[model samples]
Target: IIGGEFTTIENQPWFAAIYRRHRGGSVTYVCGGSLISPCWVISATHCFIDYPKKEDYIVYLGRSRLNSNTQGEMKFEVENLILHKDYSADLAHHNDIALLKIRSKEGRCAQPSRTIQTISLPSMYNDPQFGTSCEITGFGKENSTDYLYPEQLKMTVVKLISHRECQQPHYYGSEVTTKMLCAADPQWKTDSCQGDSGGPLVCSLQGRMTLTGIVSWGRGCALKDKPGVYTRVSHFLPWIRSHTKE
Candidate 1:
């Protein structure tokens, strides 16, 4: 983990290590995701751009470490990939969320797990307030662009920024909209990067964990005054509901 701080699977049971296939039947980690339900995994739509097939994707859950075999970690095949129909790489990369339908070899959804539990999704009226310190966790790349991803799951506290402040001329400007939520360390101490896309941006509401955002894009990793823009979960709650049935 970078910045000398990391977390274990028990704390963020919903975390997912998204992987892609390579030559010679190898697989490499790509993005991060959240296990919202037994059969559903929520992530960024951009994650499937290069490897769009459900066959090309695998999700590792209940694991904190990467590369090595972490006991209790489970792998599930993606039965389907559903990107938001309005998702666009253009228009400031709007609607960047997607849901993966996971299935086990026995043709069942994910089995019940201890370290693989799901997190609570936020209600429209109970969303976290601005300047709220959010726990953003992922296995994202550090300062380098090489394939040097850390083995441990890392995290940093980023306070949510107002849409006006994030849209100010000094910050993301017009690129940020209501659909996007911004979070950053006021001191520029930490932030999310490439490997964190589709990961959860969680905040506490009335002492309960709530998923308020999803890592989407940023000007740079932890840049001064530049924050990581996320796909606001509240605005997409309706969309998410239509797709994932109870």
Candidate 2:
């Protein structure tokens, strides 16, 4: 097990504030995503890459904690899955983001129904500076290779690093591309691990939470001298505007 301890989904209450689950029967899995619109979610490209058939996934929203009898969890089916054509698994990177359109039964937005609200995706031109503070939330583990957390959402803060610094041998190396990624260092304080992939790297700009990046890859969870990498949302503004139809 990794010796360093990062935050877990249960420890970060804000994760429950933003994301939901994509469940199938007793198999419960968490994919980190953000509400880019009232009926849409922006997530990792790989989350839906393998499962092209729509019958394979279900999205759940508005639950503070997982596996409870409480009145919080709202589940929804995915009407559409839009992934960037440039995304690939063999390359290990590229256009690592995707969008999911929520399928509501009643098709109306009201309180206590199965419907929930979505988050807004920031403008693609927004360029965040180095050393800017951001937060990532997920059901990922405190350890590098562990399974998802058993309880609520987990969150941690990470500092943005320049692309130049991220190109070092300790980081993503040559795999770091200019078109669709942003790099950051946890400085050993926090990290986004295996299960956290495809989650949001959110930053506050002008008092509003803007999703600057998407959790993509890293050397390891909280490893020394290595930082996490993300898909820069700004690079795909055209793709987002063209594909996001709700």
Candidate 3:
């Protein structure tokens, strides 16, 4: 996004890239995601509306920069795409969270490393305090014009805003829901834009980073009163645990 700053891979080790493969062997970056478990990844349901062919989806981890043919970066095939049953693209801010089960070509799951790690999900029904420190990370569109997306990862600090404020006519209107949370730029310019969908909105939980939300939708990038809307991860923790039972 226009208000983001470049970040190193080490800073956000749990970040993952969702890519698409075409017939001619062309792979295109689609959206950002988070590594919640070795076999499970967290992303947006909209990321799969048109490209739901799980086999056609590629999961990349340990990647610092996009298009990097570097060592340590691992790629996997999507074993399954489990989208929220209530996901309705026709509706605004509806159940937009999804868990993607990925496996190595050898049928193995994601292996953690220095550059690739798993971020903790909020405990069942455990919602972080409002106004807690949180931030969005992704390699989304660069500026307002959106001529192109960034090749490297980027992040912007944001604070959780009340859904009431987000529901104001100037904000996301009546579309914001309890299943979602809003993050706004209090002073400086900050936002979540296209290609950032499914990215992690992490905040400190007991001094450790935990996924608080998943970037779902927004009116536009960096517009006043149009803050980023995210799928409140904690609200769906039970649903996630049901699918990711060990």
Candidate topping lDDT: 3
For model 2, name the residue pairs that clash.
8-154, 9-152, 9-153, 9-154, 10-152, 35-119
Predicted candidate 2 versus true structure: per-residue lDDT over 117-225, tens digit per residue = 4444567667568888887777677675555463555666777888787777766677787755544445575677767777778787777777788888776677776
Prediction 2 TM-score vs. true: 0.82
Q: Write the per-residue lDDT of candidate 1 for residues 1-246, one digit (tens) a residue.
A: 224268888878899888987768899887899989889999999878767788888788888987876678888888888888887775367898999988877777766577888888888846777988889889988663546888888888888999889999889789998988998887876888878899999999889898888889888677788888999988888888888862
lDDT for predicted candidate 3 compared with the true structure: 0.85
Taking the tens digit of each residue's C-alpha lDDT, what string does model 3 give over 1-246?
Answer: 558689867789889899999999999998889999889999998888887888888988888788875478888998888888898864375999888898898999888888889999887557666676688899888776867788888998888888788888877777888888888788638788888999999998888789999999987778878888899888887889898763
Model 1 clashing residue pairs (backbone): none
lDDT, candidate 1, at 67: 87
**Which 10-residue window of candidate 1 scores lowest in summed lDDT?**
1-10
TM-score of model 3 (CA atoms): 0.95
TM-score of each: 0.94, 0.82, 0.95
What lDDT is obtained when candidate 2 is compared to the true structure? 0.65
Q: Could you tally the backbone clashes for each prediction?
A: 0, 6, 0
How would you order the candidates by TM-score, starting with the best? 3, 1, 2
In model 1, the Cα lDDT at residue 159 comes to 87
Higher-scoring candidate on TM-score, 2 or 3: 3
Report the candidate with higher TM-score, 1 versus 2.
Answer: 1
lDDT of 3 at 79: 87
